[PDB]
């Protein structure tokens, strides 16, 4: 219900680099915060969320807001934020040093667990005061691991009764209207047996106990699932159930990791070794960053556990995968994908060629391992003899700099799409129909700063924020054939259901509303789009009375596409609790530049990976150089 805690921050120099460090506290539910070191929208932060609630001036939606305090300054080595949150009526609200520093929260939702998040920018150390945030990249003894991602009849009755009294007495001996109460308890047991209608029976009994235990817990609360309660309790419950049983007898999701395209190998024989810091089943240019893994024309792999490799298809050829077990895969010149297990060699016969390929490693939730990579030290297991016999040399000397691999990531973006899904004035509206699932969503490509819609064809519509993109999901309105268009100089609505809903919500300070909606299901799409104010907005030129059509149109979905590559270091200090204060040292600088889309974090490496963006950037650079020409001031 109520919870409160205190964390005191240690000695952070506010400036190294031209940055005012990061070190904002707030709180957050699991869902919808999924930090990345790539950095979010608007050039990435905390309190960005409609998740994050963090705390200075304001944080919320990634839109700082001023706040009354008495220190009226940023946290520094001196202080102790003094955190508080109620859940019940849910308000986080805050103090520092017991000093009121104003009221905030309420009006969002229950769901998930709203823990405390601490952000450190630079060199800083802090105590937390009580008595990872996900992560593809791990943490390893030799070569970083890499793991994730984890979501976490009457006669019978008489027999029962008489048997029950005996049981109560037997139980009584061990301890050293009452039974009676014992008989009533036996009767309950009978009800449980009726509900139930070999070890599985024992498990069922334990489950029933938890369920009854659960009702008991509810009663106590009025005054956690049994797996949740814990193993010792479960074991104790199991024993009683077992005694009862003797008496009865008597009575009679997946993350894919990729390599840079530049590394690409188009010829020869090479070897890649995968290291497992995780035990489980995993599969080892064209393949999509995001999509089904291991069952496609794009690549060939088999689950370690299964002793099966997707052709894509079904096959055996191997011992079941063992945690912390060496694996070895081996040629451009021939055409095989030999698999050496522990080397300890197990391959594929006759394979197409060109466009290189490399092998892609995708890890499903909860196992980490590290896959390598460079140096002789690297041959491990090994996994060395084969290289010696194989002559399929490791990347070795080439790629002296450490290799970099793009990451699938977590959050979809409302990207452009063309001819996809097959089967994907005005007119504007279109869509593709096949055996299309819902969906919807839609989105648009015009930005408003700080006037018509047609459709018809039931479906939620609203207008989406620049940061509106978020995981979808069922998306039933609202979670945080008449078409009415609302124009904002104001209140945005339109004429709901053809005829007025009235006016629902509006912000007039200077945000910036993006229009689409999401439409889902049906044999025929029947969607029609379009513009006065909208036309004026879209073009710097105008507004003009005549309707205008953009060179560009927008779409198509956030998608669930993974493509951002990871980085160089991300070392800090962790951050040990017991003592209660964690200190982080060093500095990180991001060369990435924000788009006018806008606010996405570019990641320079990402730009390098994407040529079209790169081409545009290069052209821009040339133009800039050109303006400079002639030595003009």
């Amino acid at each position: 219900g109520k919870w409160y805690f205190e964390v005191m921050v240690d000695e952070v120099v506010p400036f190294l680099t031209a940055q005012a460090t990061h070190l904002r506290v707030g709180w957050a539910l699991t869902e919808g915060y999924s930090p990345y070191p790539g950095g979010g929208e608007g050039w990435g932060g905390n309190g960005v969320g409609d998740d994050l609630y963090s705390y200075l001036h304001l944080w919320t939606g990634h839109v700082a807001r001023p706040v009354t305090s008495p220190g009226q300054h940023l946290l520094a080595p001196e202080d102790v934020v003094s955190c508080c949150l109620d859940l019940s009526v849910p308000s986080i609200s805050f103090r520092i040093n017991g000093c009121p520093v104003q009221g905030v929260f309420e009006a969002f939702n229950l769901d998930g667990l709203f823990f405390p998040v601490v952000s450190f920018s630079a060199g800083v150390k802090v105590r937390f005061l009580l008595g990872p945030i996900k992560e593809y990249r791990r943490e390893g003894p030799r070569g970083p691991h890499l793991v994730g991602p984890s979501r976490c009849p009457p006669h019978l009755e008489r027999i029962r009764e008489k048997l029950a009294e005996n049981i109560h007495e037997l139980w009584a001996l061990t301890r050293i209207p009452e039974r009676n109460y014992n008989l009533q308890m036996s009767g309950e047991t009978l009800k449980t047996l009726l509900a139930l209608g070999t070890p599985a029976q024992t498990t069922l009994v334990d489950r029933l106990a938890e369920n009854g235990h659960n009702v008991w817990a509810r009663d106590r609360v009025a005054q956690v699932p049994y797996r949740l309660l814990d193993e010792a309790t479960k074991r104790s419950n199991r024993d009683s159930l077992c005694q009862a049983v003797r008496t009865l007898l008597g009575y009679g999701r997946v993350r894919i990791f990729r390599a840079e395209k530049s590394y690409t190998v188009q010829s020869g024989r090479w070897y890649f070794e995968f290291e497992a810091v995780t035990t489980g089943e995993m599969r080892v240019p064209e393949l999509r960053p995001d999509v089904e893994l291991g069952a496609d024309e794009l690549a060939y792999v088999f689950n370690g556990h299964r002793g099966q490799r997707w052709h894509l298809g079904s096959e055996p050829f191997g011992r079941p995968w063992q945690s912390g077990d060496v694996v070895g895969c081996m040629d451009l010149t021939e055409n095989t994908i030999i698999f050496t297990l522990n080397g300890e060699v197990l391959a594929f016969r006759e394979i197409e060629i060109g466009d290189g390929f490399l092998p892609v490693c995708s890890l499903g939730p909860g196992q980490v391992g590290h896959l390598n990579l460079g140096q002789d030290v690297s041959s491990l297991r090994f996994f060395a003899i084969c290289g010696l016999q194989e002559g399929f040399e490791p990347f070795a000397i080439n790629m002296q700099r450490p290799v970099t691999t793009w990451f699938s990531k977590s959050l979809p973006q409302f990207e452009p799409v063309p001819p996809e899904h097959p089967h994907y004035l005005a007119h504007r509206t279109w869509g593709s129909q096949n055996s299309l699932v819902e969906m919807l969503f839609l989105r648009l490509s015009l930005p408003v700063q700080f006037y018509s819609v047609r459709v018809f064809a039931c479906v939620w519509v609203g207008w989406v924020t620049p940061d509106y993109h978020q995981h979808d999901m069922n998306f039933d309105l609202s979670k945080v054939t008449d078409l009415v268009i609302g124009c904002l100089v104001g209140l945005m609505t339109f004429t709901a259901n053809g005829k007025e809903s009235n006016t629902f919500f509006q912000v007039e300070p200077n945000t910036k509303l993006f229009p689409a909606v999401f439409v889902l299901p049906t044999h025929q799409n029947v969607i029609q789009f379009e513009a006065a104010m909208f036309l004026s907005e879209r073009k710097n030129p105008a507004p003009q009375c005549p309707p205008r059509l953009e060179v560009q149109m927008l779409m198509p979905v956030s998608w669930s596409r993974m493509p951002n590559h990871f980085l160089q270091v991300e070392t800090r200090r962790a951050g040990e609790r017991l003592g209660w204060a964690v200190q982080c040292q060093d500095p990180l600088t991001m060369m990435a530049l924000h788009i006018p889309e806008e606010n996405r974090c570019m990641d320079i490496l990402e730009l390098s990976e994407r040529l079209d963006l790169q081409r545009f950037h290069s052209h821009t650079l040339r133009l800039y150089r050109a303006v400079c020409a002639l030595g003009n001031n």
């Binding site: 530049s262 080439n398 790629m399 002296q400």
Partner: protein
């Protein structure tokens, strides 16, 4: 070593050579710096 600073050995060098030329033209270089550049060339003498 399978390089590539730029995937173009030449691109990387051009970037460096141009900077060097600009510096030499500028003449904002130490005599010791000049000696270092000469050594850098091949150390013929």
């Amino acid at each position: 070593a399978r390089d590539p600073v730029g995937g173009s050995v030449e691109f990387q060098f051009v970037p460096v050579l141009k900077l060097v030329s600009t510096l030499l033209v500028m003449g904002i270089f130490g005599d010791e710096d000049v000696k270092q550049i000469l050594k850098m060339i091949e150390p013929e003498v």
